[PDB]
Amino acid sequence: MTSPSSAFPDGHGARLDAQSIRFERLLPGPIERVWAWLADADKRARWLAGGELPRQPGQTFELHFNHAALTAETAPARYAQYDRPIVARHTLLRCEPPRVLALTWGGGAGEAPSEVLFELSEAGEQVRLVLTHTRLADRAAMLDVAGGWHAHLAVLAGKLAGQAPPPFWTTLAQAEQDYEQRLLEHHHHHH
């Protein structure tokens, strides 16, 4: 299992707003190393979700939305449903290693499920990771994924640094509080 104690990265809180998800972070390792966490389904089930990659772009793979789709172990009991590994099929857009990979996310909101662009740039020793969650209808959509998604960036840095992970629920709820205050919609269209 690849887990390198290399360096402890800092970060910046996203100011302003966007109609999509915009997070650029700096990770240790050239770029291929960081890609490992994106590709390997074993470790990914400990920082996101488990589910290996298919062969064709446009195909669907089946992954499991685990405890909060990251980790829970003990929850405020206000979730329950989100505390079980739910399997679902998802389309992958592109996977061009080691540089850029793209998929489509949970389509809980109306219209088509919004997509996720992982865009890595490789620096003189380290890697820039740009998380671009595309195809968001509005702040409601980013709020839809807000339930766990953004917080995964904390555990990523934690693992990639070789350190312990932070309080998930605290971070989740805090960011949830932010988003819920910014701008929201209740856009659920059930056929």
Side-chain angles (χ1 to χ4, degrees):
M1 288 179 177
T2 311
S3 48
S5 306
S6 310
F8 304 97
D10 199 88
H12 275 255
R15 304 199 66 122
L16 302 176
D17 70 270
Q19 308 188 91
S20 300
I21 286 296
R22 238 101 180 129
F23 285 101
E24 51 179 74
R25 303 193 65 157
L26 205 295
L27 286 307
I31 185 172
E32 174 179 58
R33 190 58 51 149
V34 171
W35 167 266
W37 279 254
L38 292 165
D40 181 60
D42 177 90
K43 63 174 54 62
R44 204 181 72 204
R46 255 175 171 134
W47 71 260
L48 205 296
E52 73 177 86
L53 299 178
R55 294 295 171 150
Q56 278 182 270
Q59 287 186 329
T60 47
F61 62 95
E62 297 179 280
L63 78 173
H64 297 255
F65 292 97
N66 26 267
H67 301 260
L70 206 171
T71 191
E73 304 177 329
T74 320
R78 72 176 194 183
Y79 289 93
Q81 180 76 270
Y82 212 36
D83 184 49
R84 58 177 57 158
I86 302 179
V87 63
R89 81 185 74 251
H90 279 249
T91 308
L92 74 164
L93 203 173
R94 68 177 64 239
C95 295
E96 305 174 289
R99 270 297 170 114
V100 179
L101 98 99
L103 68 154
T104 171
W105 201 236
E111 288 278 85
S114 50
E115 47 185 81
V116 174
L117 240 307
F118 286 106
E119 305 175 77
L120 299 185
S121 324
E122 57 192 296
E125 184 190 278
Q126 298 174 270
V127 58
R128 284 192 181 216
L129 156 67
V130 181
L131 197 169
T132 311
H133 194 126
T134 20
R135 202 176 188 144
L136 292 178
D138 204 274
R139 287 67 175 200
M142 69 214 308
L143 240 175
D144 184 77
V145 314
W149 174 234
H150 43 214
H152 94 99
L153 291 176
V155 179
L156 258 181
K159 288 269 60 63
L160 285 174
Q163 60 179 30
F168 181 69
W169 294 124
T170 310
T171 307
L172 188 157
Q174 212 74 328
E176 267 275 272
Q177 287 288 30
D178 192 280
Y179 282 65
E180 256 283 292
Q181 192 63 88
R182 310 296 289 262
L183 194 163
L184 62 160
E185 290 184 74
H186 241 224
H187 193 238
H188 287 105
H189 192 77
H190 184 203
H191 69 98

Coordinates of all heavy atoms in Angstrom, one line a residue, residues 107-189:
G107 N -26.4 12.3 -9.1 CA -27.4 13.2 -9.6 C -28.6 13.2 -8.7 O -29.7 12.7 -9.1
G108 N -28.5 13.8 -7.5 CA -29.6 13.9 -6.6 C -30.5 15.0 -6.9 O -31.7 14.9 -6.7
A109 N -29.9 16.1 -7.5 CA -30.7 17.2 -7.9 C -31.3 16.9 -9.3 O -30.9 15.9 -10.0 CB -29.8 18.5 -8.0
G110 N -32.3 17.7 -9.7 CA -32.9 17.6 -11.0 C -31.9 17.7 -12.2 O -30.8 18.2 -12.0
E111 N -32.4 17.3 -13.3 CA -31.6 17.3 -14.5 C -30.5 16.2 -14.4 O -30.5 15.3 -13.6 CB -31.0 18.6 -14.8 CG -32.0 19.7 -15.3 CD -32.2 19.5 -16.8 OE1 -33.1 18.7 -17.2 OE2 -31.6 20.2 -17.6
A112 N -29.5 16.2 -15.4 CA -28.5 15.2 -15.4 C -27.5 15.4 -14.3 O -27.2 16.6 -13.9 CB -27.8 15.3 -16.8
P113 N -26.9 14.3 -13.8 CA -25.9 14.4 -12.7 C -24.7 15.2 -13.1 O -24.2 15.1 -14.2 CB -25.5 12.9 -12.6 CG -26.7 12.1 -13.1 CD -27.3 12.9 -14.2
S114 N -24.3 16.1 -12.2 CA -23.2 17.0 -12.5 C -21.9 16.2 -12.5 O -21.8 15.1 -12.0 CB -23.1 18.0 -11.4 OG -23.2 17.5 -10.1
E115 N -20.9 16.7 -13.2 CA -19.7 16.0 -13.5 C -18.5 16.5 -12.6 O -18.6 17.6 -12.1 CB -19.3 16.0 -15.0 CG -19.4 17.4 -15.5 CD -19.2 17.5 -17.0 OE1 -20.2 17.2 -17.8 OE2 -18.1 17.8 -17.5
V116 N -17.5 15.7 -12.5 CA -16.3 16.0 -11.7 C -15.0 15.9 -12.5 O -14.7 14.8 -13.1 CB -16.2 15.1 -10.5 CG1 -14.9 15.3 -9.7 CG2 -17.4 15.2 -9.6
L117 N -14.3 17.0 -12.7 CA -13.1 17.0 -13.3 C -11.9 17.0 -12.3 O -11.9 18.0 -11.5 CB -13.0 18.2 -14.2 CG -12.8 18.0 -15.7 CD1 -11.6 17.0 -15.9 CD2 -14.0 17.4 -16.3
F118 N -11.1 16.0 -12.4 CA -9.9 16.1 -11.6 C -8.8 16.4 -12.6 O -8.5 15.7 -13.6 CB -9.6 14.7 -11.0 CG -10.4 14.4 -9.8 CD1 -11.4 13.5 -9.8 CD2 -10.2 15.1 -8.6 CE1 -12.2 13.2 -8.7 CE2 -10.9 14.8 -7.5 CZ -12.0 13.9 -7.5
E119 N -8.1 17.5 -12.3 CA -7.1 18.0 -13.2 C -5.8 18.3 -12.5 O -5.7 19.2 -11.6 CB -7.6 19.3 -13.9 CG -8.9 19.2 -14.6 CD -9.4 20.5 -15.2 OE1 -8.9 21.0 -16.2 OE2 -10.4 21.1 -14.5
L120 N -4.8 17.4 -12.8 CA -3.5 17.5 -12.1 C -2.5 18.2 -13.0 O -2.4 17.9 -14.2 CB -3.1 16.1 -11.7 CG -4.0 15.4 -10.7 CD1 -3.3 14.1 -10.3 CD2 -4.3 16.2 -9.5
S121 N -1.8 19.1 -12.4 CA -0.6 19.7 -13.1 C 0.6 19.4 -12.3 O 0.6 19.4 -11.1 CB -0.8 21.2 -13.1 OG -2.2 21.6 -13.3
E122 N 1.7 19.1 -13.0 CA 2.9 18.6 -12.3 C 3.9 19.6 -12.3 O 4.3 20.2 -13.3 CB 3.4 17.3 -13.0 CG 3.7 17.5 -14.5 CD 3.9 16.2 -15.2 OE1 4.9 15.5 -14.9 OE2 3.1 15.8 -16.1
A123 N 4.4 19.9 -11.1 CA 5.3 21.0 -10.8 C 6.7 20.4 -10.7 O 7.0 19.3 -11.1 CB 4.9 21.7 -9.6
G124 N 7.7 21.2 -10.2 CA 9.1 20.9 -10.2 C 9.4 19.8 -9.2 O 10.6 19.4 -9.0
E125 N 8.4 19.2 -8.5 CA 8.6 18.2 -7.5 C 7.2 17.8 -7.0 O 7.0 16.6 -6.5 CB 9.5 18.6 -6.4 CG 9.8 17.6 -5.4 CD 10.5 18.1 -4.2 OE1 11.7 18.3 -4.2 OE2 9.8 18.3 -3.1
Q126 N 6.3 18.7 -7.0 CA 5.0 18.5 -6.4 C 3.9 18.6 -7.5 O 4.2 18.8 -8.7 CB 4.7 19.5 -5.3 CG 5.7 19.4 -4.2 CD 5.5 20.5 -3.1 OE1 6.2 21.5 -3.2 NE2 4.7 20.2 -2.1
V127 N 2.7 18.4 -7.1 CA 1.6 18.4 -8.1 C 0.5 19.4 -7.6 O 0.1 19.5 -6.4 CB 1.0 17.0 -8.2 CG1 0.5 16.5 -6.9 CG2 -0.1 17.0 -9.3
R128 N -0.1 20.1 -8.6 CA -1.2 20.9 -8.4 C -2.5 20.1 -8.7 O -2.6 19.6 -9.8 CB -1.2 22.2 -9.3 CG -0.3 23.3 -8.8 CD -0.6 24.5 -9.6 NE 0.3 25.6 -9.3 CZ -0.1 26.9 -9.2 NH1 -1.4 27.3 -9.4 NH2 0.8 27.9 -8.9
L129 N -3.4 20.0 -7.8 CA -4.7 19.4 -8.0 C -5.8 20.4 -8.1 O -6.0 21.2 -7.2 CB -5.0 18.3 -6.9 CG -6.5 18.0 -6.7 CD1 -7.0 17.3 -8.0 CD2 -6.7 17.2 -5.5
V130 N -6.5 20.4 -9.2 CA -7.6 21.3 -9.4 C -8.9 20.5 -9.5 O -9.1 19.7 -10.5 CB -7.4 22.1 -10.7 CG1 -8.6 23.1 -10.9 CG2 -6.2 22.9 -10.7
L131 N -9.7 20.6 -8.5 CA -11.0 19.9 -8.5 C -12.0 20.8 -9.1 O -12.4 21.8 -8.5 CB -11.4 19.5 -7.0 CG -12.5 18.4 -6.9 CD1 -12.6 17.9 -5.5 CD2 -13.8 18.9 -7.3
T132 N -12.5 20.4 -10.3 CA -13.4 21.2 -11.0 C -14.7 20.4 -11.1 O -14.9 19.6 -11.9 CB -12.9 21.6 -12.4 OG1 -11.6 22.1 -12.3 CG2 -13.9 22.6 -13.0
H133 N -15.7 20.7 -10.2 CA -17.0 20.0 -10.3 C -17.8 20.8 -11.3 O -18.3 21.9 -11.0 CB -17.7 19.9 -9.0 CG -18.8 18.9 -8.9 ND1 -18.9 17.9 -8.0 CD2 -19.9 18.8 -9.7 CE1 -20.0 17.2 -8.2 NE2 -20.6 17.8 -9.3
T134 N -18.0 20.2 -12.5 CA -18.7 20.8 -13.6 C -20.1 20.4 -13.7 O -20.6 19.5 -12.9 CB -18.0 20.4 -14.9 OG1 -17.2 19.2 -14.7 CG2 -17.0 21.5 -15.4
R135 N -20.9 21.1 -14.6 CA -22.2 20.7 -14.9 C -23.2 21.0 -13.7 O -24.2 20.4 -13.6 CB -22.3 19.3 -15.4 CG -23.5 18.9 -16.2 CD -23.4 17.5 -16.7 NE -24.4 17.1 -17.7 CZ -24.2 16.3 -18.7 NH1 -23.0 15.8 -18.9 NH2 -25.2 16.0 -19.5
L136 N -22.8 21.9 -12.8 CA -23.6 22.2 -11.7 C -24.7 23.2 -12.2 O -24.4 24.2 -12.8 CB -22.8 22.9 -10.6 CG -21.9 21.9 -9.9 CD1 -21.1 22.6 -8.8 CD2 -22.6 20.8 -9.2
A137 N -26.0 22.9 -11.8 CA -27.1 23.8 -12.2 C -27.0 25.1 -11.5 O -27.3 26.2 -12.1 CB -28.4 23.1 -11.9
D138 N -26.6 25.1 -10.3 CA -26.4 26.3 -9.5 C -25.8 25.9 -8.1 O -25.4 24.8 -7.9 CB -27.8 27.0 -9.3 CG -27.6 28.5 -9.0 OD1 -27.5 28.9 -7.8 OD2 -27.7 29.3 -10.0
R139 N -25.9 26.9 -7.2 CA -25.3 26.6 -5.8 C -26.1 25.5 -5.1 O -25.5 24.9 -4.2 CB -25.4 27.9 -5.0 CG -24.4 29.0 -5.4 CD -24.7 29.6 -6.7 NE -23.8 30.7 -7.1 CZ -24.1 31.6 -8.0 NH1 -25.3 31.5 -8.7 NH2 -23.3 32.6 -8.3
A140 N -27.3 25.3 -5.5 CA -28.1 24.2 -5.0 C -27.4 22.8 -5.3 O -27.4 21.9 -4.5 CB -29.5 24.2 -5.6
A141 N -26.8 22.7 -6.5 CA -26.2 21.5 -6.9 C -24.9 21.3 -6.1 O -24.7 20.2 -5.6 CB -25.9 21.6 -8.4
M142 N -24.0 22.3 -6.0 CA -22.8 22.2 -5.2 C -23.2 21.9 -3.7 O -22.5 21.2 -3.0 CB -22.0 23.4 -5.3 CG -22.5 24.7 -4.7 SD -22.1 26.2 -5.6 CE -20.3 26.0 -5.8
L143 N -24.4 22.4 -3.3 CA -24.9 22.1 -2.0 C -25.4 20.7 -1.9 O -25.4 20.0 -0.9 CB -26.1 23.0 -1.6 CG -25.9 23.9 -0.4 CD1 -27.0 24.9 -0.2 CD2 -25.8 23.0 0.9
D144 N -25.8 20.1 -3.1 CA -26.3 18.7 -3.1 C -25.1 17.8 -2.9 O -25.2 16.8 -2.1 CB -26.9 18.4 -4.5 CG -27.5 17.0 -4.5 OD1 -28.6 16.7 -3.9 OD2 -26.8 16.1 -5.1
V145 N -24.0 18.1 -3.5 CA -22.8 17.3 -3.3 C -22.1 17.7 -2.0 O -21.3 16.9 -1.5 CB -21.8 17.5 -4.5 CG1 -22.5 17.4 -5.8 CG2 -21.0 18.8 -4.4
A146 N -22.4 18.9 -1.5 CA -21.8 19.4 -0.3 C -21.9 18.4 0.9 O -21.0 18.5 1.8 CB -22.5 20.7 0.2
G147 N -22.8 17.5 0.8 CA -22.9 16.5 1.9 C -21.8 15.4 1.8 O -22.0 14.3 1.4
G148 N -20.6 15.8 2.1 CA -19.5 14.9 2.2 C -18.4 15.2 1.2 O -17.2 15.2 1.5
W149 N -18.8 15.6 -0.1 CA -17.9 15.7 -1.2 C -16.7 16.6 -0.9 O -15.6 16.2 -0.8 CB -18.7 16.2 -2.4 CG -17.8 16.5 -3.6 CD1 -17.8 17.7 -4.3 CD2 -16.9 15.7 -4.3 NE1 -17.0 17.6 -5.4 CE2 -16.4 16.4 -5.4 CE3 -16.4 14.4 -4.0 CZ2 -15.4 15.9 -6.2 CZ3 -15.5 13.8 -4.9 CH2 -15.0 14.6 -6.0
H150 N -17.0 17.9 -0.7 CA -15.9 18.9 -0.5 C -14.9 18.5 0.6 O -13.7 18.6 0.5 CB -16.4 20.3 -0.2 CG -17.6 20.4 0.8 ND1 -18.5 21.4 0.6 CD2 -17.9 19.7 1.9 CE1 -19.4 21.2 1.6 NE2 -19.1 20.2 2.4
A151 N -15.4 17.9 1.7 CA -14.7 17.5 2.9 C -13.6 16.5 2.5 O -12.6 16.3 3.3 CB -15.6 17.0 4.0
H152 N -13.8 15.7 1.5 CA -12.9 14.7 1.1 C -11.5 15.2 0.8 O -10.5 14.5 0.8 CB -13.4 13.9 -0.2 CG -12.9 14.3 -1.5 ND1 -11.9 13.7 -2.2 CD2 -13.4 15.3 -2.3 CE1 -11.7 14.3 -3.3 NE2 -12.6 15.3 -3.4
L153 N -11.5 16.5 0.4 CA -10.2 17.2 0.1 C -9.3 17.3 1.4 O -8.1 17.4 1.3 CB -10.5 18.6 -0.4 CG -11.1 18.6 -1.8 CD1 -11.4 20.0 -2.3 CD2 -10.2 17.9 -2.8
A154 N -9.9 17.2 2.5 CA -9.2 17.3 3.8 C -8.5 16.0 4.1 O -7.3 15.9 4.4 CB -10.1 17.7 4.9
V155 N -9.2 14.9 3.9 CA -8.7 13.5 4.1 C -7.6 13.2 3.1 O -6.6 12.5 3.4 CB -9.8 12.5 4.1 CG1 -9.3 11.1 4.3 CG2 -10.8 12.8 5.2
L156 N -7.8 13.7 1.8 CA -6.9 13.5 0.8 C -5.5 14.1 1.2 O -4.5 13.3 1.2 CB -7.3 14.3 -0.5 CG -7.9 13.4 -1.6 CD1 -8.2 14.2 -2.8 CD2 -6.9 12.3 -2.0
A157 N -5.5 15.3 1.6 CA -4.2 16.0 2.0 C -3.7 15.2 3.2 O -2.5 15.1 3.3 CB -4.5 17.4 2.4
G158 N -4.6 14.8 4.1 CA -4.1 14.1 5.3 C -3.4 12.8 4.9 O -2.3 12.5 5.5
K159 N -4.0 12.0 4.0 CA -3.4 10.8 3.6 C -2.1 11.0 2.8 O -1.1 10.4 3.1 CB -4.4 9.9 2.8 CG -5.5 9.3 3.6 CD -5.1 8.0 4.2 CE -3.9 8.0 5.1 NZ -4.1 8.8 6.3
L160 N -2.2 11.9 1.8 CA -1.1 12.2 0.9 C 0.1 12.8 1.7 O 1.2 12.8 1.2 CB -1.6 13.1 -0.2 CG -2.4 12.4 -1.3 CD1 -2.9 13.3 -2.3 CD2 -1.5 11.3 -2.0
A161 N -0.2 13.5 2.8 CA 0.9 14.0 3.7 C 1.5 12.9 4.6 O 2.6 13.0 5.0 CB 0.4 15.2 4.5
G162 N 0.7 11.9 4.8 CA 1.1 10.8 5.7 C 0.7 11.1 7.1 O 1.3 10.6 8.1
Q163 N -0.3 11.9 7.3 CA -0.7 12.3 8.7 C -2.1 11.7 8.9 O -2.7 11.0 8.1 CB -0.8 13.8 8.8 CG -1.7 14.5 7.9 CD -1.7 16.0 8.1 OE1 -0.7 16.6 8.5 NE2 -2.9 16.6 7.8
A164 N -2.6 12.0 10.1 CA -4.0 11.5 10.5 C -5.0 12.4 9.9 O -4.8 13.6 9.5 CB -4.1 11.5 12.0
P165 N -6.2 11.9 9.7 CA -7.4 12.6 9.1 C -8.0 13.5 10.2 O -8.0 13.2 11.4 CB -8.3 11.5 8.7 CG -8.1 10.4 9.6 CD -6.6 10.5 9.9
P166 N -8.7 14.6 9.8 CA -9.3 15.5 10.7 C -10.8 15.1 11.0 O -11.3 14.1 10.4 CB -9.4 16.8 9.8 CG -9.5 16.4 8.4 CD -8.7 15.1 8.3
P167 N -11.4 15.7 12.0 CA -12.8 15.5 12.3 C -13.7 15.7 11.1 O -13.9 16.8 10.7 CB -13.1 16.5 13.4 CG -12.1 17.5 13.4 CD -10.8 16.8 12.8
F168 N -14.3 14.6 10.6 CA -15.0 14.6 9.4 C -16.3 15.4 9.5 O -16.6 16.3 8.8 CB -15.3 13.2 8.9 CG -16.1 13.1 7.6 CD1 -15.5 13.6 6.4 CD2 -17.4 12.7 7.6 CE1 -16.2 13.5 5.2 CE2 -18.1 12.6 6.4 CZ -17.5 13.1 5.2
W169 N -17.1 15.0 10.5 CA -18.5 15.6 10.7 C -18.4 17.1 11.0 O -19.2 17.8 10.5 CB -19.2 14.9 11.9 CG -19.6 13.5 11.6 CD1 -19.2 12.4 12.3 CD2 -20.3 13.0 10.5 NE1 -19.7 11.2 11.7 CE2 -20.4 11.6 10.6 CE3 -20.9 13.6 9.3 CZ2 -21.1 10.8 9.7 CZ3 -21.6 12.8 8.4 CH2 -21.6 11.4 8.6
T170 N -17.4 17.4 11.8 CA -17.2 18.8 12.1 C -16.9 19.6 10.9 O -17.5 20.7 10.6 CB -16.0 19.0 13.1 OG1 -16.1 18.1 14.2 CG2 -15.8 20.4 13.6
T171 N -16.0 19.1 10.0 CA -15.7 19.8 8.8 C -16.8 19.8 7.8 O -17.2 20.8 7.2 CB -14.4 19.1 8.1 OG1 -13.4 19.0 9.0 CG2 -14.0 19.8 6.9
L172 N -17.5 18.6 7.7 CA -18.7 18.5 6.8 C -19.7 19.5 7.2 O -20.2 20.3 6.4 CB -19.2 17.0 6.9 CG -20.3 16.7 5.9 CD1 -20.3 15.2 5.7 CD2 -21.7 17.1 6.4
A173 N -20.1 19.5 8.5 CA -21.2 20.3 8.9 C -20.9 21.8 8.8 O -21.7 22.6 8.5 CB -21.6 19.9 10.4
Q174 N -19.6 22.1 9.1 CA -19.2 23.5 9.0 C -19.3 24.0 7.6 O -19.9 25.1 7.4 CB -17.7 23.5 9.5 CG -17.3 24.8 10.1 CD -17.9 24.9 11.6 OE1 -18.9 24.4 11.9 NE2 -17.1 25.6 12.4
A175 N -18.8 23.3 6.7 CA -18.9 23.6 5.3 C -20.3 23.6 4.8 O -20.7 24.4 4.0 CB -18.0 22.7 4.4
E176 N -21.1 22.7 5.3 CA -22.5 22.6 5.0 C -23.2 23.9 5.5 O -24.0 24.4 4.8 CB -23.1 21.4 5.8 CG -23.1 20.1 4.9 CD -24.4 20.0 4.1 OE1 -25.4 19.5 4.6 OE2 -24.3 20.4 2.9
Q177 N -22.9 24.3 6.7 CA -23.4 25.6 7.3 C -23.1 26.7 6.3 O -23.9 27.6 6.1 CB -22.8 25.8 8.6 CG -23.3 24.9 9.7 CD -24.8 25.2 10.1 OE1 -25.6 25.7 9.3 NE2 -25.1 24.9 11.4
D178 N -21.8 26.8 5.8 CA -21.5 27.8 4.9 C -22.3 27.8 3.6 O -23.0 28.8 3.4 CB -20.0 27.7 4.5 CG -19.4 28.9 3.7 OD1 -19.7 29.1 2.5 OD2 -18.8 29.7 4.4
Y179 N -22.3 26.7 2.9 CA -23.1 26.5 1.7 C -24.6 26.8 1.9 O -25.2 27.6 1.1 CB -23.0 25.1 1.2 CG -21.7 24.8 0.4 CD1 -20.5 24.9 1.1 CD2 -21.7 24.5 -0.9 CE1 -19.3 24.6 0.5 CE2 -20.5 24.2 -1.6 CZ -19.3 24.3 -0.9 OH -18.1 24.0 -1.5
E180 N -25.2 26.3 3.0 CA -26.6 26.5 3.3 C -26.9 27.9 3.5 O -28.1 28.3 3.4 CB -26.9 25.7 4.6 CG -27.6 24.4 4.3 CD -29.1 24.6 4.1 OE1 -29.8 25.0 5.0 OE2 -29.6 24.3 2.9
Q181 N -25.9 28.7 3.9 CA -26.1 30.1 4.1 C -25.9 31.0 2.9 O -26.6 32.0 2.7 CB -25.1 30.6 5.2 CG -25.4 32.0 5.8 CD -26.7 32.0 6.5 OE1 -26.8 31.7 7.7 NE2 -27.8 32.4 5.8
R182 N -25.1 30.5 2.0 CA -24.8 31.2 0.7 C -26.0 31.4 -0.2 O -26.5 32.4 -0.3 CB -23.7 30.5 0.0 CG -22.5 30.1 0.8 CD -21.7 31.3 1.3 NE -21.0 32.0 0.3 CZ -19.7 31.9 0.0 NH1 -19.0 31.0 0.7 NH2 -19.1 32.6 -0.9
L183 N -26.4 30.3 -0.8 CA -27.5 30.3 -1.8 C -27.9 28.8 -2.0 O -27.0 28.0 -2.2 CB -27.0 30.9 -3.1 CG -28.1 31.3 -4.1 CD1 -27.5 32.3 -5.1 CD2 -28.6 30.1 -4.8
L184 N -29.2 28.6 -2.0 CA -29.7 27.2 -2.2 C -31.0 27.2 -3.0 O -31.7 28.2 -3.1 CB -29.9 26.6 -0.8 CG -30.9 27.2 0.1 CD1 -31.4 26.3 1.2 CD2 -30.3 28.5 0.8
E185 N -31.3 26.0 -3.4 CA -32.6 25.7 -4.1 C -33.0 24.3 -3.6 O -32.2 23.5 -3.2 CB -32.5 25.7 -5.6 CG -32.3 27.0 -6.2 CD -32.3 26.9 -7.8 OE1 -33.4 26.7 -8.3 OE2 -31.2 27.0 -8.4
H186 N -34.3 24.0 -3.7 CA -34.8 22.7 -3.5 C -35.2 22.1 -4.8 O -36.4 22.0 -5.1 CB -35.9 22.7 -2.5 CG -35.7 21.9 -1.2 ND1 -36.6 21.1 -0.6 CD2 -34.5 21.9 -0.4 CE1 -36.0 20.5 0.5 NE2 -34.8 21.0 0.6
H187 N -34.3 21.7 -5.6 CA -34.5 21.3 -7.0 C -34.5 19.8 -7.1 O -33.5 19.2 -7.6 CB -33.5 22.0 -7.9 CG -33.8 21.9 -9.4 ND1 -33.0 21.3 -10.3 CD2 -34.9 22.4 -10.0 CE1 -33.6 21.4 -11.5 NE2 -34.7 22.1 -11.4
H188 N -35.6 19.1 -6.8 CA -35.7 17.7 -6.9 C -36.8 17.4 -7.9 O -38.0 17.6 -7.5 CB -35.9 17.0 -5.6 CG -34.7 16.9 -4.7 ND1 -34.5 17.8 -3.6 CD2 -33.6 16.2 -4.8 CE1 -33.3 17.5 -3.1 NE2 -32.8 16.5 -3.8
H189 N -36.5 16.8 -9.0 CA -37.5 16.5 -10.0 C -37.7 15.0 -10.2 O -36.9 14.3 -10.8 CB -37.2 17.1 -11.3 CG -38.3 17.1 -12.3 ND1 -39.4 18.0 -12.3 CD2 -38.5 16.4 -13.4 CE1 -40.2 17.8 -13.3 NE2 -39.7 16.8 -14.0

